[PDB]
Design a protein around this ligand. Structure first.
Ligand code: HEM
Ligand code: HEM
Ligand SMILES: CNCCN(C)c1cc(C#N)cc(CCc2cc(C)cc(N)n2)c1
Ligand SMILES: CNCCN(C)c1cc(C#N)cc(CCc2cc(C)cc(N)n2)c1
Ligand SMILES: C[C@H](O)[C@H](O)[C@H]1CNc2nc(N)[nH]c(=O)c2N1
Ligand SMILES: C[C@H](O)[C@H](O)[C@H]1CNc2nc(N)[nH]c(=O)c2N1
Ligand SMILES: [Cl-]
Ligand SMILES: [Cl-]
Lengths: 362, 362
C-alpha cells in the first residue's frame, strides 16, 4: 500500500509542478524514472527544482496562513546532504542568520533529509527555533507557559534555564540512531529581540516586555509528492497581532492585559468599559511601533488582509482554486474590519502542504 | 411525503417536549390525537404549552446566538387567533411596547397563525420591526444601505421617507388573499432610540449618531414539530458590538469609523497606527455607555460570552448536546479575549429552530 501511496502522490505532484514550471513535456520521462526508482529503492529523490517549487506550493496551500501572497519568493535551502548533529546545528544557526538578515526578514525554509521508512533522519524538538522557556512549580509561573513541557524535557537533558521570563530555549533535536536528543544554546548574537515601547505612552516601557524578531516554525512536516520532510523549519515575518493579541495577551500565555491597562491609565474593573479591548489596541500599536523602530520586518493585520485579498485575486486569475481556514485567517482583533470576515473559504486540504506531527516529548 | 414529514417531526417534538415538561406519560395519547388530526385535517394544532416550550427550544437551538443562557425565560405571545390586518398591526405594535418595557427589555416572541399548505396566512416584509430606511440614487447615499431594497419596495406602495439618515421604516406585511402588502407608520411614542455619546469625549455627540433600543427580527420562520410559523417576530436586547462594530462601522452599513477617528482626535492615515481598531473600541464604549445612561438594556461582549459559558455548562449538566456556529458566536471585536474563540462547536441543526426564508421583495 505504502509504495502505491507514494507513486500516486508522485504522479499528481510531478504533473502539477511541471505544468507550473512550463516543463510539461518532461513529465512522462521523469515519471518513468521515478517509477523505476520507487520499484528498486522504495522511494525517490526530488530534483532541486522539484524540492524548491514543492515547498513553495506547500506554502501556497496552507489554509491557515494570511501571508500567502508571497509564496513564490520563498527562499529554499536544500540541506538533504546533512549527516551529523554538528551539520544540523550549523544549518539551523545559518537559517536563523540568513532569515533574520539584519532585521529585513527573508522568508526561508531549510529542508533536511526526509523520512525513509517513516524513519526520521533528524527529529527537531523545538516548536520554533527561537522561543522562550516556561516554568511552573509551587504556584510560581515564569516565562511562556506554552513552553513548559519542552522546557521540562530540556532540563532533563542537563540544560538549566536562568528562570527569567524570557530565557531562550536551546536548539534541541535527535539524530537517527541516537536514543537522546542533543541540545545547543543559541548564540545571542544570532537572535534579534525587540523591546516593546509605545509611541506616546512613556510608561509602557515599565512593563519590560520584549519579543523575538523571527518566528521560525520547526515542528511541522513538509509533504511533497509523497515524500515526508518531517524536519523542514520555515519562517516569515510576524503579523503584529500574533504577538500583541495572543503571545503577550492570552491568559495562558504572558497574560499582560491587566498590566497594560494600568500603564495606559485606565481602570480594569468593569466589562462595560471595554478595558481589555482598549488595552489590546494599545499593546498592538506598541508591538508594531517597536518592530518598525528597530528595523525588524512586521506587518499589521489590515495590510496583511489587503495582501491576502491580492492572493485571492491572483489565484482566480491563474485559474487555481483557493483554499482557506476562515477561523485562522481572521485576525484576533477587529476581524470585521477586514474583508476576510465577510466571505467564506473552502477548507479543503491540497498537497504539497505543511502538517502537524506528534511531539517526541509529551 | 409532506404528511409523513409532519408526523415524523411531530413525534420527535412531542416526545422531547413532554420529557422536558415532565409530561412523559401523556405522550402516547397526545400522539394518537395528533395522528388522527393529521389524517383528517392535513395538519395539527399545538397546545399553548407546546407552542411556548417549542419557541423556547427553538431559541435554545439557535447555533448563532450567544444570548441563549436565557432561553427558558422567553415571553411567548400566542397570536394564532388573528384574522385581520388591523389585528396583525396592533399585535406588532403591542410586541414593540411590551418587549420595550420602558427600556428594561423583555425577550419576547409573538406567534401568528402558521403556514397551512405552505400557504402563508400573514407575510411580514420587515427584516426587523424597527429599522432605518436606506436610499441610493445618483451617487447619493442616505440612511442604512442594508435597507435599500425594502425601502424601495415601500416607496412603491405609496410610502415616502423623509430621507434623513434615520427614517423609521413602516411596518409592512401581506395577508393571505391580498395581492399587495399594507403598510403602517410606527407611532414614535412606541420607539425608543438612544443618542450615542461618549463617557469622556464631548465631541463625540458632533457625529449625531443614534440607534434604536430593541432589535426585533421579523423575517425568520419558527419551526416546531413540523409546523411552520413563518410569521413569528422575536427580540432580545442588543450586544453592544452589533451596533458599534457592525451597524455603525461596516463600510456597507453606516461606515462611521473615519468620522469616529476624527472626533476622538487620531489620524486615519496609516494602517500601522491601528486607527480603525482604536476607533472601533471608542465607538463601542460609546454605545454601551449611551444605552446604560438612558436605562435601555444592553450587554457587552465579555459579559455575554461569560453568560454563554454558563449556557454551555448548563447544557452539559442537563445532558443536552450543545450546538453552535463558532463563526457567529465570536464577537467582532477582541474575539480572542473570550473563551468562545478558544474552543470549537458542533454546528448541527436541531429542531425546533428559527430558519431563514425567501424575501417577498427582491
Ligand atoms: C511572510 C510572512 C508571513 C506572515 C505575515 C504569515 C502570517 C501567518 C499567520 C498570522 C498565521 C497564523 C498562525 C497563528 O495564529 O499562530 C500563519 C499560519 C501559518 N503560516 Fe504563515 N505567514 C507568513 C509566512 C509563512 C511561510 C513562509 C510559511 C511556510 C513556508 C507559512 C506557513 C504557515 C502555516 C503552515 C501556518 C499554519 C500553522 C499552524 O497550523 O499552526 N507562513 N501565517
Ligand atoms: C436576550 C438577549 C439576546 C442577545 C444578547 C442575543 C445575541 C445575539 C447576537 C449577538 C447574535 C448575532 C447576530 C448578528 O450578528 O446579526 C444573535 C443571533 C441570533 N439570535 Fe440571539 N440574542 C438574544 C436573544 C435572542 C432571542 C430572544 C432569540 C429568539 C427567540 C434569538 C435568536 C437568535 C437567532 C435566530 C440568531 C441568528 C440570526 C441569523 O442567523 O441571522 N436571540 N443573538
Ligand atoms: C501544534 N502547533 C501549534 C501551532 N500554533 C498554534 C502556532 C503557535 C504559535 C505560537 N505562539 C505560532 C505559530 C506560527 C504562525 C506563523 C508562522 C510563520 C512562518 C510566520 C508567522 N508570521 N506566523 C503557530
Ligand atoms: C437574512 N437575514 C440576515 C440576518 N442578519 C445578518 C442579521 C442582521 C442584523 C442586522 N443588522 C441583525 C440580526 C439580529 C441579531 C439579534 C437578534 C436578537 C433577537 C437579539 C440580538 N441582540 N441580536 C441578524
Ligand atoms: C462570511 C462570514 O461567515 C460572515 O461574515 C459572518 C461571520 N460572522 C458573523 N457573526 C455575526 N455575529 N454576525 C454576522 O453578520 C457575521 N457574518
Ligand atoms: C478553537 C479555535 O479554532 C482556535 O481558538 C483557533 C481559532 N483561530 C485561530 N487563529 C489563529 N490565527 N491562531 C490560532 O491559534 C487560532 N486558534
Ligand atoms: Cl508565535
Ligand atoms: Cl441589528
Amino acid at each position: 500500500e505504502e509504495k502505491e501511496i507514494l507513486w500516486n502522490e508522485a504522479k499528481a505532484f510531478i504533473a502539477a509542478c511541471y505544468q507550473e514550471l512550463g516543463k510539461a513535456a518532461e513529465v512522462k520521462d521523469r515519471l518513468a524514472d521515478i517509477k523505476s526508482e520507487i520499484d528498486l529503492t522504495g522511494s525517490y529523490v526530488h530534483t532541486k527544482e522539484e524540492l524548491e517549487h514543492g515547498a513553495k506550493m506547500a506554502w501556497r496551500n496552507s489554509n491557515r496562513c494570511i501571508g500567502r501572497l508571497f509564496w513564490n519568493s520563498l527562499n529554499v535551502i536544500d540541506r538533504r546532504d546533512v549527516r551529523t548533529k554538528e551539520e544540523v546545528r550549523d544549518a539551523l544557526f545559518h537559517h536563523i542568520e540568513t532569515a533574520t538578515n539584519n532585521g529585513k526578514i527573508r522568508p526561508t525554509i531549510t529542508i533536511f533529509p526526509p523520512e525513509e521508512k517513516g524513519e526520521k533522519q533528524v527529529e527537531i524538538w523545538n516548536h520554533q527555533l527561537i522561543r522562550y522557556a516556561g516554568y511552573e512549580s509551587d504556584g510560581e509561573r515564569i516565562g511562556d507557559p506554552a513552553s513548559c513541557s519542552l522546557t521540562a524535557a530540556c532540563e532533563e537533558l542537563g540544560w538549566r534555564g536562568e528562570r527569567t521570563d524570557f530565557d531562550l530555549l536551546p536548539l534541541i533535536f535527535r539524530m537517527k540512531g541516537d536514543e537522546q536528543p542533543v541540545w545547543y544554546e543559541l548564540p545571542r548574537s544570532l537572535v534579534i529581540e525587540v523591546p516593546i515601547t509605545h509611541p506616546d505612552i512613556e510608561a509602557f516601557s515599565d512593563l519590560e516586555l520584549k519579543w523575538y524578531g523571527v518566528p521560525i516554525i520547526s515542528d511541522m512536516k513538509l509533504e511533497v509528492g509523497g515524500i515526508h520532510y518531517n524536519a523542514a523549519p520555515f519562517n516569515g515575518w510576524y503579523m503584529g497581532t500574533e504577538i500583541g493579541a495572543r503571545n503577550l495577551a492570552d491568559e495562558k500565555r504572558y497574560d499582560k492585559l491587566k498590566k497594560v491597562a494600568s500603564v495606559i491609565g485606565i481602570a480594569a474593573d468593569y466589562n462595560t468599559d471595554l478595558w481589555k479591548d482598549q488595552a489590546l489596541v494599545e499593546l498592538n500599536k506598541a508591538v508594531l511601533h517597536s518592530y518598525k523602530k528597530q528595523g525588524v520586518s512586521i506587518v499589521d493585520h489590515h495590510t496583511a488582509a489587503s495582501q491576502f485579498k491580492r492572493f485571492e485575486e491572483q489565484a482566480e486569475e491563474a485559474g487555481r482554486k483557493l483554499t482557506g481556514d476562515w477561523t485562522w485567517l481572521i485576525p484576533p482583533i477587529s476581524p470585521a474590519a477586514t474583508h476576510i470576515f465577510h466571505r467564506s473559504y473552502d477548507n479543503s486540504i491540497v498537497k504539497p502542504n505543511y502538517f502537524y506531527q506528534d511531539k517526541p516529548y509529551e
